Design a binder for this molecule. Structure first.
Ligand SMILES: CCCCCCCC/C=C\CCCCCCCC(=O)O[C@@H](COC(=O)CCCCCCCCCCCCCCC)COP(=O)([O-])OCC[N+](C)(C)C
Ligand SMILES: CCCCCCCC/C=C\CCCCCCCC(=O)O[C@@H](COC(=O)CCCCCCCCCCCCCCC)COP(=O)([O-])OCC[N+](C)(C)C
Ligand SMILES: CC(C)CCC[C@@H](C)[C@H]1CC[C@@H]2[C@H]3CC=C4C[C@H](OC(=O)CCC(=O)O)CC[C@]4(C)[C@@H]3CC[C@@]21C
Ligand SMILES: CC(C)CCC[C@@H](C)[C@H]1CC[C@@H]2[C@H]3CC=C4C[C@H](OC(=O)CCC(=O)O)CC[C@]4(C)[C@@H]3CC[C@@]21C
Ligand SMILES: CC(C)CCC[C@@H](C)[C@H]1CC[C@@H]2[C@H]3CC=C4C[C@H](OC(=O)CCC(=O)O)CC[C@]4(C)[C@@H]3CC[C@@]21C
Ligand SMILES: CC(C)CCC[C@@H](C)[C@H]1CC[C@@H]2[C@H]3CC=C4C[C@H](OC(=O)CCC(=O)O)CC[C@]4(C)[C@@H]3CC[C@@]21C
Ligand SMILES: CC(C)CCC[C@@H](C)[C@H]1CC[C@@H]2[C@H]3CC=C4C[C@H](OC(=O)CCC(=O)O)CC[C@]4(C)[C@@H]3CC[C@@]21C
Ligand SMILES: CC(C)CCC[C@@H](C)[C@H]1CC[C@@H]2[C@H]3CC=C4C[C@H](OC(=O)CCC(=O)O)CC[C@]4(C)[C@@H]3CC[C@@]21C
Ligand SMILES: [Mg+2]
Ligand SMILES: [Mg+2]
Ligand SMILES: [Mg+2]
Lengths: 580, 580
C-alpha cells in the first residue's frame, strides 16, 4: 500500500522533472530526474530516436550511465530501447559501445507480485522476454553472455519459463539454446541450476508451465521402435524421480503452493511413473501400514473399554451428582490377571505412541497434526495414570476420537474413497469456517434470549436453559435439530418463549439449508468433478512420504536401469502407446 | 506387472543384440537376437528396404524363418512388412516365396488387455487391420486364405469388428467379403462362427460395434414397398431373436459385461422387437407373476402375524427382562381351528418357497440372491417349527424384510418405476459401499469416546451408552439423527460429553450432507438422465428370463413366419417408418 503509494508519487515526480528541464522536455518529444534518468533514457522511453541521437552525439558517456533510483537501479538506456523494441536505437546504442552485460538491480525488475513483469537483469533477458529475435541475434554479436545469472540465480532459460505467453517462450528457448555451442562448460545451459537448485526442466514442472514441460520432455524421449500404430518410447526419468540424493520433481510439485503445478502430474512420463510405483510398492505397504494402525487403535480402544474403575468411596455430594464410579489408584489398577493383560495392551499403546512421535516430530498437513495430537494425548494418559491424576477421561476421549479419525487417512489407498477425505477437509476449512461465525452469533442471540425467558421459571419442568452454559448448548442442539423443542404441555410456558422459538425455528431451518447449498457447491464441483486429479495428488504425496520413511530394501527404484542395456547409469521408464 | 517388466527387459535386450552384431546393426539403418529375430526382421522393422534386399539375396531361406521368442512366436518378416506398410518389401518378400499362411502365435499378438493391438495371426488379418487395401489385393493373389481362423477362432471378418477405427473396419469388411466367391463351402464367411459361436453379426452386437451392426443389418433388410414418405421394411430377425435352440443376440448382450453393447438395444430392428414382445406377452405375464407373488407375501405375512405364542412358564429372570410370551411347542401350535387355518397358509408358504428353489437353484443378479435367501429363510422357519427350536423370530424377520423387498422387483414392469430400482442398487453398491468405511470409523471413534465418558456415571439417568454394544448402536442412531441427543437436565453430565457431542454433531451433519451430494451425483446423471436406456435393458433381461422359464404355449415366437408368405422358414419383423 505505502510502497505502491511511493511508486506513483515517484512516477508523478518524474513527470515534473521532465517539465522543469527544457532539454529533458525536448527529449520527451548531465541533469538527472527523480528516477535518476537522463535525456537519453527519456528519449529511449518514449521511442524518441532523433532526440537520442542528438544527445548521444553531445554526451557519448551518457550511454554508459545507469539510472540511480532504487526503483530502476542499474538500468541503462540499452535496457529501455530493448524492451521498447526500437531496433535502430539499439543499433545506435551498441555503436556507442553500450554494455550488454549491465545488471538492472532495481526493485521494479525483481520478481515480486507487486511487479507485473519479471524480465531478469540483462538486456538478453529483456529482449527474449519481449520476444525480439533480432535483438537477441544482435546482442550476442556484441558479446552478451547467455549464461548470465540473476540475484534469483535465473538464467534466460529460467526466465522464459516464467513468462505468461508460453508459446513465444518456446521459440526463444529454442533460439538461445541453439546459441550456446559450448562443451567446455561443466553444465550446459539446460542443466544450469538456479539458486533454488531447479533446472529449466524442473522449473517448468514447479510453475506448471505445461508446454515448456512438453518441449523439454522431447529432449528426454528416446523412441525405441515403431510398429505401425504402436510405438515404444523410453523416458529419461532422471529428474522426475531423483531420489536418494535430492528432492524429486514430484516432491517439488507437492510442496509448492501452485495449483497449476499439479497439471504436470497428468503429463505422460509423470503419470505412468506414479501409477507404476503406486501399484508396485505404494499400495501393498500402505495397506499393510493401514492394517497395523487399525489393530493398534483396536488395541487402544480395548484398553480404554477396560480402564481401571472402582466404586466411589465418597458419598453423593448433591442431588444432581450422577457419579457412581471413580478411577483406581496405581497400585489398585494392577493386581489381577485381567489387569496384567490390559497392562500389555497399554504398554503396546504407549510404545506405539512413542514410535509415532519419532517418525513425525524430528522430521518437522492435517493428518500430521491429528496423529501427533493422538500420540500426545496417549502420553498424557500414561502420565496421569502413573501419578494417579484424576480426569483421564479427558485425554482418552480426545485420543479415541482422534485415533479413530486417523483411520480415515487410509481411505486414499482406494481410488473412490480418497477424494471423499478431500471433501471433508474443504467443507470444514471452507464452508464451515466461514459459516460458523454467522451461525454461532445466531446461537448466542437466541440462547441469551432463551435463558432470561426461563430465568424466572422453575427448571424442573424445563431445564434446557437452567444456567447459561447449558442454554448455549441446548440452543446449539436446537439449531441442528438433534434434540426436540422444549415443551411441557402440563404447565404454562412464557408467551415470549413461543414467539422466540418460532422465530428461532424459522432461522435455524433457513440457515441450515444455506449450509447445505454451500456444501453443495463445494463437494460437487471442486472435488467430485476433479476426483481423479485429487486422488493422484494424494498418491504422490503419500508415496514421497513413504520414500522418506522407508528403508532401501523395501523400496526399489522405479524404471529400468541401463548399463545392463548400454543407455547410461540412468533409470529409464518404457511406455508403449498407440499413436492413432 | 512382472510380465510387463519382462517385456521391457526383452525389448531392451533386443536393442543390445542389434548392437553386438555389426551385420544386425547395419540392418537397423544366421545370427538371431533376443526375440529370435534376424537381420531381415530388423530391416523390415525399421523399413530398411535396401538392407532387406541384400540380406535376402544372401539368405533366401531367411524369408521362411520365423521369430523364435515367446513374445513374437511364429512371426516372419512378411508380418512385419505388412503392418509397417512397406509395399515394395512386401512385393519383394512374396517374390522370394514367402508363406502367406504363416500363423503368429506370439503372446504379443493374442487378444489380451495387456496388448494394445489385436491383429490376428495371418498376414491378411494384419493387412486389413492396418488398412492396406493393396496388400490385401496382393496377398490373395498369392494364395492367402480368407477363411483362416485363429486360436480364438476369429476369421478376418471377426477381427475387423474388433478394431478401434470402425469406419475403416467397414470398408475392409466390404473388400474381403467381396473376395470370397464360394458357394461350395457350407458356411459363407459372414456365417462362419468363431469358437464362441458368434457370427460377425453377433460379434458386432456383443462388442457394441454400432456401425458394423448397421452395415450388417442392411444385408438383413428387405424393403417391401415405398409410399412417398412411407416405406415398409422387413427385418430378418434370425439372430437377434434365436430361441428354442440357442442363445439370442439379446441374450448375449445382457450376459456380457460391456456397457457399449447396450447401445445395440437402441438400433431399429432390436428396439421394435423388444417393445413388441414386451407389450404382447412380456407385460401381462409379468404383472400376473407379480400379483401371484404379492398374494404369496401377504399370505406369508399373515402366518407371521398369527404365529403360535403362549404366556411364559418361567418367571422373570432380571429387572431388565421384557419377555412376556414365548413360542409354543409343536403339538400346542396346532390344536384349534385358527391353528388349522394358519396351517394351510404356512403350507402354502413352504410349497411356495420350494417352488422358488426349483426355478432358481438348479439353474445356477441381486434379486436372484434376495429371493433365494427369502426361500432359504422360510425353510429354516419350518425346520425350527418342526423341532420346536426357539428363535423363530430371527428367520421370519429376515424373511419378512427380504420377502417384501422382492415385491420391488416388479416395479420394472412400469416404465417410470424401473430406473428407481436402478437408483437403489447404485446408491447402495456405489456411494454406500464407499462411504460406510469413512462413516463407521467416525462412529467407532465417538462411540468409544461416549462409552468411557459415561462409564463412571449411573446408567439410569442416561443409558444410551450403558455397555459398549449399545454405545455403538446409539452413536449410529445419533449419526443419522433418528434418536435425540442424550440429555437429562436434572443431573450434571460430564463436561467432556458436551464437548464430544458437539464435536460429533458437527461431523455427523457434515458427513451426512456429504452422503447426500454423493447420492446426488449418482441418481441424477447416471440413472435419471439414462432412465429409458436402463429400463429397456431391464426388459430384455426380464424377457430372456421369462423365455427360459415358461412353456412354449404361453410364449409365441415374435415376428411373422414365412412359408405362408414365401420368404423362408425364418421369422420376419415388419417395420413401417417415415423417411422424412
Ligand atoms: C462460548 C463458551 C464460553 C462462554 C461462557 C461464559 C462463561 C460462563 O460461565 O458464563 C457465566 C457468566 O455468564 C456471563 O455473564 C458471560 C456471558 C456473556 C456473553 C458471552 C460472550 C461470548 C461471545 C464470544 C454464566 O453464569 P450462570 O451461573 O449460568 O448465570 C449467571 C449467574 N446468575 C444466576 C447470578 C445470574
Ligand atoms: C461392530 C460390532 C461388534 C463389535 C463389538 C465388540 C464385542 C463386544 O461385545 O464388546 C465387548 C468388549 O468390548 C471390547 O473391548 C471390544 C471392542 C473394541 C473395539 C471394537 C473393534 C471393532 C472395529 C472393527 C463389550 O463388553 P461390555 O460389557 O460392553 O463392557 C466391557 C466390560 N467391562 C464393563 C468390564 C469394562
Ligand atoms: C507397538 C508397536 C509395534 C505398534 C506400531 C505403531 C504403528 C501403529 C504406527 C507407528 C508410526 C506409524 C505411523 C506413523 C507415520 C505414518 C504418516 C501418516 O499420515 C500423515 O500424517 C500424512 C500427512 C497428510 O497427508 O496429511 C499417518 C500414519 C503413518 C504411516 C504410520 C501409521 C502407523 C504407524 C506404523
Ligand atoms: C473429543 C473431541 C472433542 C475431539 C475434537 C474433534 C476434531 C478436533 C477433529 C476430530 C475429527 C476431524 C477430523 C477428522 C477428519 C478430517 C479429514 C481431513 O482431510 C484431508 O486431510 C484431505 C487432504 C489430504 O491430506 O490429502 C483433515 C482433518 C478432518 C477434518 C478432521 C480434523 C478435525 C476433526 C474435526
Ligand atoms: C415463515 C413463516 C412466516 C410461517 C408462517 C407461520 C407463523 C407466522 C405462525 C405459525 C403459528 C404461530 C403462532 C402460533 C402460536 C404462537 C403463541 C403465542 O401466545 C401463546 O399462546 C403462548 C402460550 C402461553 O402464554 O402459555 C402467540 C403467537 C405464536 C408464537 C405464533 C405466531 C406465529 C406463528 C409462528
Ligand atoms: C403355493 C404356490 C402356488 C405359490 C406360488 C409361488 C410364487 C409366489 C413364486 C414361485 C417361483 C416364482 C418366482 C420365481 C422366479 C422369478 C425371478 C424374479 O427376479 C429375479 O430374480 C431376476 C434377476 C434380477 O433382475 O435381479 C423374482 C420372482 C420370479 C418371477 C417368481 C415370482 C414368484 C413366483 C411365481
Ligand atoms: C431383517 C434385516 C436385518 C434384513 C437386512 C436388509 C438388507 C440385507 C436388504 C433388505 C432391503 C434391500 C434391498 C432392497 C432392494 C434393493 C434394489 C436393488 O435393485 C436392482 O437390482 C436394480 C438392478 C436390476 O436388477 O435391474 C437390489 C438390492 C436392494 C438394494 C436391497 C438389497 C439389500 C437390502 C439392503
Ligand atoms: C460450527 C461451530 C464452530 C459453530 C459454533 C458454535 C460452538 C463453537 C459452540 C456453541 C455453544 C457450545 C458451547 C456451549 C456450552 C458447552 C459446555 C461446556 O461446559 C459445561 O458446562 C458442561 C456441563 C457440566 O459440566 O455439567 C463448555 C463449552 C460447550 C461444549 C460449548 C463449546 C462450544 C459450543 C459447541
Ligand atoms: Mg469449502
Ligand atoms: Mg424426540
Ligand atoms: Mg454409486
Amino acid at each position: 500500500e505505502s510502497w505502491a503509494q511511493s511508486r506513483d508519487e515517484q512516477n508523478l515526480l518524474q513527470q515534473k522533472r521532465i517539465w522543469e528541464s527544457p532539454l529533458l522536455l525536448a527529449a520527451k518529444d548531465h541533469q538527472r530526474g527523480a528516477m535518476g534518468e537522463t535525456a537519453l533514457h527519456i528519449a529511449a522511453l518514449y521511442d524518441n530516436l532523433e532526440a537520442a541521437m542528438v544527445l548521444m552525439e553531445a554526451a557519448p558517456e551518457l550511454v554508459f550511465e545507469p539510472m540511480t533510483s532504487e526503483l530502476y537501479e542499474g538500468q541503462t538506456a540499452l535496457h529501455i530501447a530493448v524492451v521498447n523494441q526500437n531496433m535502430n536505437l539499439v543499433r545506435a546504442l551498441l555503436a556507442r559501445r553500450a554494455s550488454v552485460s549491465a545488471r538492472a538491480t532495481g526493485t521494479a525488475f525483481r520478481r515480486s507480485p507487486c511487479n507485473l513483469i519479471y524480465f531478469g537483469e540483462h538486456p538478453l533477458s529483456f529482449a527474449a522476454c519481449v520476444n525480439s529475435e533480432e535483438i537477441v541475434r544482435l546482442l550476442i554479436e556484441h558479446g552478451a553472455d547467455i549464461r548470465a545469472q540473476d540475484s534469483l540465480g535465473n538464467t534466460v532459460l529460467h526466465i522464459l519459463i516464467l513468462q505468461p505467453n508460453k508459446t513465444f517462450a518456446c521459440q526463444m528457448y529454442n533460439l538461445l539454446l541453439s546459441y550456446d555451442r559450448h562443451g567446455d562448460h561443466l553444465q550446459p545451459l539446460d542443466l544450469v541450476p538456479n539458486h533454488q537448485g531447479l533446472t529449466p526442466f524442473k522449473l517448468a514442472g514447479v510453475e506448471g508451465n505445461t508446454v515448456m514441460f512438453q518441449h523439454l520432455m522431447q529432449k528426454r524421449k528416446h523412441t525405441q521402435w515403431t510398429y505401425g500404430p504402436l510405438t515404444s518410447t523410453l523416458y529419461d526419468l532422471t529428474e522426475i524421480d531423483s531420489s536418494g540424493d535430492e528432492q524429486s520433481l514430484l516432491e517439488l510439485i507437492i510442496t509448492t503452493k501452485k495449483r497449476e503445478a499439479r497439471q504436470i502430474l497428468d503429463q505422460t512420463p509423470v503419470k505412468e511413473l506414479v501409477s507404476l510405483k503406486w501399484k508396485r510398492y505404494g499400495r501393498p505397504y500402505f495397506c499393510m501400514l493401514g492394517a497395523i494402525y487399525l489393530l493398534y487403535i483396536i488395541c487402544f480402544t480395548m484398553c480404554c473399554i477396560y480402564r481401571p474403575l472402582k466404586p466411589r468411596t465418597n458419598n453423593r455430594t448433591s442431588p444432581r451428582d450422577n457419579t457412581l464410579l471413580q478411577q483406581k489408584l496405581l497400585q489398585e489398577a494392577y493386581m489381577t490377571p485381567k489387569d496384567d493383560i490390559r497392562l500389555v495392551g497399554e504398554l503396546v499403546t504407549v510404545i506405539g505412541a512413542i514410535i509415532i512421535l519419532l517418525v513425525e516430530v524430528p522430521d518437522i498437513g492435517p493428518f500430521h497434526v491429528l496423529i501427533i495430537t493422538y500420540a500426545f494425548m496417549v502420553l498424557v494418559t500414561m502420565v496421569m495414570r502413573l501419578i494417579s491424576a484424576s480426569g483421564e477421561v479427558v485425554p482418552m476421549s480426545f485420543a479415541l476420537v482422534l485415533g479413530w479419525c486417523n483411520v480415515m487417512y487410509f481411505a486414499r489407498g482406494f481410488q473412490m474413497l480418497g477424494p471423499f477425505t478431500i471433501m471433508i477437509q474443504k467443507m470444514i476449512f471452507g464452508d464451515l469456517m466461514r459459516f460458523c461465525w454467522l451461525m454461532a452469533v445466531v446461537i448466542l442471540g437466541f440462547a441469551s434470549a432463551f435463558y432470561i425467558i426461563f430465568q424466572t421459571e422453575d427448571p424442573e419442568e424445563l431445564g434446557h436453559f437452567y444456567d447459561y452454559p447449558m442454554a448455549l448448548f441446548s440452543t446449539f442442539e436446537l439449531f441442528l435439530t438433534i434434540i426436540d423443542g422444549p415443551a411441557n404441555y402440563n404447565v404454562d410456558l412464557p408467551f415470549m418463549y413461543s414467539i422466540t422459538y418460532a422465530a428461532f425455528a424459522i432461522i435455524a431451518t433457513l440457515l441450515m439449508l444455506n449450509l447445505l447449498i454451500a456444501m453443495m457447491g463445494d463437494t460437487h464441483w471442486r472435488v467430485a468433478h476433479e476426483r481423479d486429479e485429487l486422488w493422484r495428488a494424494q498418491i504422490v504425496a503419500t508415496t514421497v512420504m513413504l520414500e522418506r520413511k522407508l528403508p532401501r530394501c523395501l523400496w526399489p527404484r522405479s524404471g529400468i536401469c541401463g548399463r545392463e542395456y548400454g543407455l547410461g547409469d540412468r533409470w529409464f521408464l518404457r511406455v508403449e502407446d498407440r499413436q492413432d
